[PDB]
Write a protein that binds this ligand. Structure first.
Ligand SMILES: Cc1ncc(COP(=O)(O)O)c(/C=N/[C@@H]2[C@@H](O)[C@@H](OP(=O)(O)OP(=O)(O)OC[C@H]3O[C@@H](n4cc(C)c(=O)[nH]c4=O)C[C@@H]3O)O[C@H](C)[C@H]2O)c1O
Ligand SMILES: Cc1ncc(COP(=O)(O)O)c(/C=N/[C@@H]2[C@@H](O)[C@@H](OP(=O)(O)OP(=O)(O)OC[C@H]3O[C@@H](n4cc(C)c(=O)[nH]c4=O)C[C@@H]3O)O[C@H](C)[C@H]2O)c1O
Ligand SMILES: [Cl-]
Ligand code: NA
Lengths: 366, 361
């Protein structure tokens, strides 16, 4: 104990320490190969992640923002084409739209799911709408049925932002296989997290998959040639290998998260706290509580040596980078942003720690 | 087979240190924007003689972010060499700027500075200089024009790590500079990697934000940015290798000298080094280029072309395909690169020179 009592929001050392021997073995394998980019590890991980999601194709890319940006670029929509998207998602969802010179059309979530309210989408469809981007926020899959029907009615693409929901299931399909194309983040904090920036795109469409590979490789499908004006967005061999190791435990890990979320849901009882009771399958990337006393709560937990993070306190429309959206009246989204706080959760989290989080919350008088 | 660029041989020198640092990073529990990135950035900045180094995700991203940060208007013009790698041009068009393509000097393979001014217009906002194949571009006139015309100078340093011009390094010859650390570059990562260098405090801070979703501070986005970061692991691997970069570049100098002193074949035009050349690519030029590549291949010598189709002739740039750039076009029809690397063995480079001398067409 001679190397150098605070409960960290997400202890990645502890999550990853289980795999250190394997990571090192695979690193040395890569060194032996002399190949660090677009190699056998990327191919292997792609194949395995496609199988996991139930899709035909997976393309490793540099991060989850790029994965969304690439999808939208591949569709080659006109300037100011409209993409419907939840108002309360992480900003990178919206950045991917505006970077492609599309107009985001911000929809309120359901207060009881934190995910886009499907019943509010149709009224905002216009002749410029080209896609709906669903986000499975915090880990909970969106109620996809009406959204799929609407996409079909209006000949819209469905783009899934799966950054927070790796392996969740709606009816008979995995997230990643509920629309036309899907972006994932494997940022280290995610349920399946790399040791660096990393992402993917999933799809069943052969042409789309091919076009994405070229677009993510300078626009080059063949050495020396550039069919498209592309970008550089690749998944390193090293990261692909690390992800493949962890992917073998991802269902087991997510079910362990479910066990801890269900402990919180059943054991936390405080009139000042609204618990995130799930309406659909939830893999609990984030365990988000809601209170009118949010900053007080975070200070209270900190005083009791529990670290928390807010996801999120400023919604995209109120950010300085989007002053042209600051006017929008989105009171549900705004309320959420004032009131949410995330509690520590992870698949390797200690019983004494989750028991403390619950007990400390129960004791909170505000 | 003799490989064009044997990266296993180059990187095997550092395996024990790479493994140590990887394990240190595991011990840290921090993989993004941590101590390794800071350390490498600080050392690379010192290496280039600049105030600020921002690790980013790759070379293309480096150039894209520099241009994004300047907030140019759609169709603003950026003067750039026509014969550079296509990613220099992709950075420009990604920002909805217009690449104004200038012929190189056949004696440097770099932008001909005497051909820049005639192409400057009210829309010109920048010159992108590229230090192609390892050789620094002649900046004197470029600096004068930038001053006269209120242009930014952006350096694409992806092929010329460490090259020197007068009292300065590439990276410190303009307003801001992009670097690739793709594994094949003179300083190569074990993955995709890049940086931006600059002396301007405000610009540097803006670039940091822009490469981090546009966020300077947790929770807040000042700008509509990208996610373009240099991983801790890659920063570590680069910082190990950086200590040997000048030495590695001198090793390439030695091989290039051997080629220059020993290849004697009337069918082959050899490269010169008017200004400092770190010899990322050793580029020969012949009317029988495909023939030569095939011949070398029959002799178990792998080569690559840099490059056979110029940016303006690419299908992605249809609207440029009509542009008449005969110097650039002729170069693309005639160049081939010979194997060169800091670790390349004597017997291997002697064979390349000998087989080239035997090419009797
Ligand atoms: C819906 C949606 N769409 C697109 C995206 C874009 O994907 P991306 O481009 O891959 O980021 C996201 C990203 N989403 C996340 C976003 O939710 C937010 O996550 P966060 O929990 O606030 O992030 P964090 O604080 O950096 O890390 C969480 C915890 O993990 C610990 N940690 C972290 C790191 C990096 C480490 O090395 N060591 C650690 O111990 C520290 C913290 O306790 O910001 C991230 C940078 C984004 O990737 C998204 O949610
Ligand atoms: C002027 C300028 N500006 C911007 C850029 C953009 O930088 P980037 O976004 O960081 O790529 C470049 C990149 N420029 C290079 C470009 O010159 C070209 O380089 P190349 O020599 O044709 O590339 P390569 O064939 O992939 O590798 C060279 C040799 O190295 C071996 N190798 C390679 C890898 C990756 C490996 O893992 N193991 C190996 O053994 C195989 C080959 O024999 O293509 C690259 C993808 C670009 O990064 C440029 O030159
Ligand atoms: Cl022969
Ligand atoms: Na990367």
């Amino acid at each position: 104990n001679l190397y150098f009592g605070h409960m960290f929001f997400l202890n990645l050392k502890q999550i990853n320490d289980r795999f250190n021997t394997e990571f090192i073995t695979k690193f040395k394998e890569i060194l032996e190969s002399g190949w660090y980019i677009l190699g056998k590890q990327c191919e292997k991980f792609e194949n395995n992640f496609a199988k996991y999601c139930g899709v035909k194709h997976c393309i490793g890319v540099a991060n989850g923002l790029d994965a969304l940006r690439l999808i939208i670029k591949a569709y080659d929509f006109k300037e100011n084409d409209e993409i419907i998207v939840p108002a309360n998602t992480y900003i990178a969802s919206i950045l991917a739209i505006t970077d492609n010179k599309c107009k985001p059309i911000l929809i309120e979530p359901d207060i009881n799911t934190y995910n886009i309210n499907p019943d509010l989408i149709e009224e905002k469809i216009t002749k410029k709408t080209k896609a709906i981007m669903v986000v499975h926020l915090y880990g909970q899959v969106c109620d996809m049925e009406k959204i799929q029907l609407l996409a079909n009615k209006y000949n819209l693409k469905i783009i899934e932002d799966c950054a927070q929901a790796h392996g969740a299931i709606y009816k008979d399909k995995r997230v990643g296989n509920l629309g036309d194309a899907a972006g994932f983040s494997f940022y280290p904090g995610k349920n399946l997290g790399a040791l660096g920036d990393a992402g993917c795109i999933c799809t069943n469409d052969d042409n789309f998959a091919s076009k994405i590979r070229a677009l993510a490789n300078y626009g080059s499908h063949k050495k020396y040639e550039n069919l498209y004006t592309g970008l550089n967005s690749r998944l390193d061999e090293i990261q692909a290998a690390f992800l493949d190791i962890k992917l073998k435990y991802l269902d087991e890990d997510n079910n362990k998260r479910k066990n801890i979320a269900n402990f919180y849901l059943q054991n936390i009882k405080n009139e000042n706290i609204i618990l995130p009771s799930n309406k659909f399958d939830h893999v609990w990337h984030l365990f988000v509580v809601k209170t009118k006393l949010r900053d007080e709560l975070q200070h209270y937990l900190n005083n009791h040596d529990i670290q928390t993070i807010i996801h999120y306190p400023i919604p995209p429309h109120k950010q300085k980078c989007y002053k042209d959206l600051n006017h929008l009246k989105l009171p549900i989204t705004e309320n959420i942003h004032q009131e949410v706080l995330s509690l520590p959760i992870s698949p390797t989290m200690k019983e004494n720690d989750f028991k403390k989080v619950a007990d400390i919350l129960n004791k909170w008088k505000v």
